[PDB]
Symmetry: D2
């Protein structure tokens, strides 16, 4: 009333799962946009039939035309490369995507600025904390209207792994991973809870040990790499994380979700994007929540931001 | 496969909303049992038509026959009185329901023992922490197969009121209320989080004050009384809370939910039921979680348990 | 984005279930408006806590102030009486509500016209086919922006009863009941299908007989009366039916649903509202579907419309 | 209670979407089984994190070990090839998969017979009407416990395409495609309805023409081929169709769904599987519904069955 229009700029692995999930949730009409010919139209057609099974009413169309951005309510950018040519799976590193994806963000930004300057933008393309700011600069959208995917996805892993050990509902585990979405992501041990209870209580009771948690932290940081070596650059959980973010905006849920956002003094940082809990509602980023990090946590935060800053200089 | 059978022992205000919600969620076949003639059959018929609108397939039948408990997978007991004769709305107090409801629990217990000794039992009838133990004693069911409603409902209020001030998704507020479901319920300030973050951070930032929280605590404790004076003994939120509990069992969700359960040393208490976080899954109460309360919190816990113990002696 | 505002004009039995269902489905903010003091505020408070259990974010407020209609996206009118003074349950007849409810519709219409002339209106108050036109005349809203509840509720019953005999998913039974919501409702045997198959195939196969169907027709027509005599004027299924209608509008589902709507030549009738399949989407009544009734079916349709016309003359 | 175990025999494109959808719907624990090393473990890990975003509690594990079939409640077989070596996309034809997939079905059948003879089996591998019977013969399961995917998927397309022209909710279009899932699929014009109304009424009203319908029929038959040429062998809608079938079984929904099933005299055919509406509930295929086809429709049905019979002789 009228349905939201959601344009998926990039119709690859993540784009595909996102279109499926949007139809499942009847969230809005979908455009699968890509530079590749024919492919988005085929995925769109396939996906469109699921309206019947899903009891939904969302158009799904493929596109190779940038002007289809006009009318967009939400734009999700996954366009770009997943690996650098010449690198082995073992050497996969998000940083190496920088020179491959930077020009793509600039190009998409110009099209967003012209066609849908009032759209809410979610950036996924890596290295995401660099790409999101690049897209902000070139699209001209307000700071409350653009975020990057990171924390929802990283914490989904941490939360899940802990829930498996403790035999509780995965959603009942809460956790914060901040700073940047990459190898220096900051896993905040102090901010983990289980059913709202400090994880330390479960550690005291020998239900999960400090050593076990350390292994889970390492597993979390290395999850993307693990999946890349077993199969491919992850796409199912990324897609679900993105749609959770988009849905909070579309339905004014006001969920607290960790995303990459413009910092203006939080954690002592300005002029850069970094991962922190934000509240997402109808007005976009409605609140930026600054964790009251201790000195040691801040030092880790600084190390994460330093990586983003280093690559921004290279971009 | 085969559908669960859920018997609602008591088909009054809460029974009615529970049957509606069960059909909405397609959770299982429903029996609305009551001592009142005709009424449960009418509510059952009305509710049964919603299968069409809900895309569900749950039978809803009315009953005046205790043997319909046979085959029950889940039994929810709301049977009893909501107010004591002669009391004004202003003087409403759960304790006064004790002499009115005790015999009803004993009678229902015998029927459960005979007909569905393997059913999972949820007790709602007040005073609930007393009634749940009474029903445990008379039904003979295992300690992991019977709980009382309290904490999910009490915290729903605390969580909601805080979410309204902070402008966040209500589910993103987590909170613990323990001990007993009554005027001595223990509201644990230290165990409140918002998006997994300690509420104290929001207090430090002047987003919500200590005084505001105190008023919200008082409002929470007095919510039932407030609604009784405006309208009636609450039933919509109680129903939703109960169904959240029942659903966790039925679908093996392993949610952490605060319920009245048999204590065997937790908090220094045994031989009595009290409200504490538990994990509910296919095996019933799969874990009893003992909060590592400080000395002052424990003193409040003791005061709550003392009320249950006092009335148990009167029952 | 921004959330829809749904004003429930009338906060009685149907109003209450509607508020519960709106929160379950996170459809929009809710105002429970009534002339009765205190009651709507109590129901609103009770219902509001279910946001936690439902993972929703809908405000629920009570009101005694007509100006709260301002900003309404959807207005659902249930205000009025359910029985006439002096009538026994056995003599319950919707027609007798005419003199009791007519003035209420006129009053509400004026408030709608002043405060929310662009709102989509659903009329429930009986006799509904008369009341809906009355409200149309006094609210001044466009013909595509006001409908009356009838067919979704009447067919829910017919569909359900058949599904019980045939042991199929209730939603897989489709059926049409047209003309008016009252004792002359037209049950169109020819337009019944099961899994899209003509019911006649199942009759040919002796899975359900003509006599059985006749009994189901009588049961359907008399369902309200049956429930009134067992318990109360039905409210759970009415509520669900209404919310299915409101949801189709809000989410632009374009569902085909039988509702009371302004006829402009369909079935040979103009200047009156009658029950017929319509398509409900973001533009309100997007299509009025005229069944190609045979001569005998039309005669039944005419008899139904004649009752509406008779009472319109009495109103 | 306890959760269902769903084993996906084949973890390729359809397997992946099915695992995603199972977690979204919290339907049961999932095993992604494949002969390919590492791949299923990576997809399983990726998918498992979505439990957090989905509020679900389903294990997702990868496997290369046939014995993981033990304990299966539902087995979905997609194992096999999607195209024949040497064929161009333009020449794609399901029949050419026969010699590639027959041995795979025999092998899987033996493992099912040994490990989970009581599981409900859904066969997807093409040519499906041949493969499903092959799997029936080798698994030894009862006729009511094995079906093949076809009609739900084929009609999803027909229903959707019509809904796009008529501007109605796609689920409100009902349609039957029977016989076999291949180029001779039988599209039954007479059994199409829109909101339960015969499509002929909409044709009479010039809302959709006979010529338009003919083009939609051709488009439906050729949809797989169209998508193969634009992108790949379809997987999103197939997955959704399969999960709709599996869910009806798991939750005892009793939905009427067109699937390939053992014929024992229906349509004049025995000793072969063919597509027809069936009712799926807790007892598996609870009813086989025989459409009362006219002579001309039957001739088309016979042509479809003849293709299955021809390839069965070649298998
Ligand atoms: N932020 C995160 O947490 C996170 C998580 C996973 C993935 N990633 C990143 O997301 C990106 C997408 O991953 P994927 O798995 O979907 O990759 P993919 O290769 O399957 O899809 C990317 C698509 O982008 C398309 N593309 C290239 N240029 C384009 C342009 N100008 N406009 C539109 N489309 C264009 C490609 O043709 C391709 O189809 C990668 O950069 C990956 O590193 C980020
Ligand atoms: N634990 C909690 O958090 C909580 C919350 C709200 C309500 N309550 C309590 O729940 C109970 C029910 O509340 P309600 O609003 O549904 O009240 P209600 O009066 O609407 O319904 C109670 C029903 O119990 C029936 N009944 C009496 N004896 C019975 C028997 N032997 N077997 C079956 N039914 C019998 C009555 O006829 C009545 O229909 C009350 O005791 C109330 O105090 C507890
Ligand atoms: N169309 C249908 O299929 C259908 C189905 C069921 C009910 N009904 C009708 O719906 C109406 C409501 O039924 P219910 O069960 O909710 O009855 P109810 O008596 O529980 O509630 C009606 C409410 O309207 C209120 N009211 C009276 N005047 C008002 C005004 N000016 N503004 C706001 N509120 C006002 C009353 O105080 C009461 O709370 C009845 O007329 C009934 O016959 C119609
Ligand atoms: N019935 C239908 O309506 C319908 C619809 C679409 C697809 N299909 C068929 O479904 C099948 C699967 O399609 P897809 O898109 O998922 O193909 P896919 O190639 O992506 O996946 C098939 C998987 O089967 C695996 N496999 C091979 N032998 C195996 C074995 N012995 N055990 C377990 N796994 C084995 C392969 O390694 C591969 O991962 C194809 O035959 C296709 O024609 C049928
Ligand atoms: O973390 C991930 O899943 C990821 N996968 O590819 N790029 C990423 O950032
Ligand atoms: O807390 C409540 O809602 C309540 N209402 O009636 N009894 C109770 O315990
Ligand atoms: O049909 C009904 O349910 C009904 N109940 O009260 N009035 C009505 O129209
Ligand atoms: O119909 C289909 O989608 C299909 N795709 O690949 N094989 C099939 O049968």
């Amino acid at each position: 009333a009228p349905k939201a229009k959601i344009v998926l700029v990039g119709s690859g692995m993540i784009g595909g799962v996102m279109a499926t999930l949007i139809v499942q949730k009847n969230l809005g009409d979908v455009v699968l946009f890509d530079i590749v010919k024919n492919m988005p139209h085929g995925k769109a057609l396939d996906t469109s039939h699921t309206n019947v099974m899903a009891y939904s009413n969302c158009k799904v169309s493929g596109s190779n035309t940038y002007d289809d951005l006009a009318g967009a309510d939400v734009v999700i950018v996954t366009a770009g490369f997943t690996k650098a040519p010449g690198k082995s799976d073992k050497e996969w590193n998000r940083d190496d995507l920088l020179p491959l994806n930077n020009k793509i963000m600039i190009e998409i930004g110009g099209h967003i600025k012209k066609n849908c300057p009032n759209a809410f933008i979610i950036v996924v393309t890596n290295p995401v904390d660099v790409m999101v700011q690049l897209l902000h600069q070139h699209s001209g959208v307000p700071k409350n209207k653009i975020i990057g995917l990171g924390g929802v996805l990283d914490t989904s892993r941490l939360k899940y792994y802990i829930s498996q050990k403790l035999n509780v509902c995965p959603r009942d585990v809460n956790a914060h991973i901040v700073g940047a979405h990459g190898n220096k992501m900051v896993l905040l041990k102090r901010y983990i809870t289980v059913g709202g209870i400090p994880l330390q209580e479960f550690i005291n009771n020998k239900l999960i040990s400090d050593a076990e948690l350390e292994a889970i932290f390492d597993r979390t940081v290395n999850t993307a790499l693990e999946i890349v070596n077993l199969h491919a650059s992850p796409y199912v959980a990324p897609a679900a994380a993105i749609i959770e973010m988009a849905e909070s905006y579309l339905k004014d849920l006001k969920k607290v979700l960790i995303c990459s956002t413009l910092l203006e003094g939080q954690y002592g940082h300005s002029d850069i994007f970094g991962g922190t809990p934000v509240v997402l509602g109808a007005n976009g980023v409605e609140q930026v929540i600054e964790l009251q990090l201790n000195s040691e946590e801040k030092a880790k935060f600084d190390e994460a931001i330093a990586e983003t800053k280093r690559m921004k200089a290279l971009a």
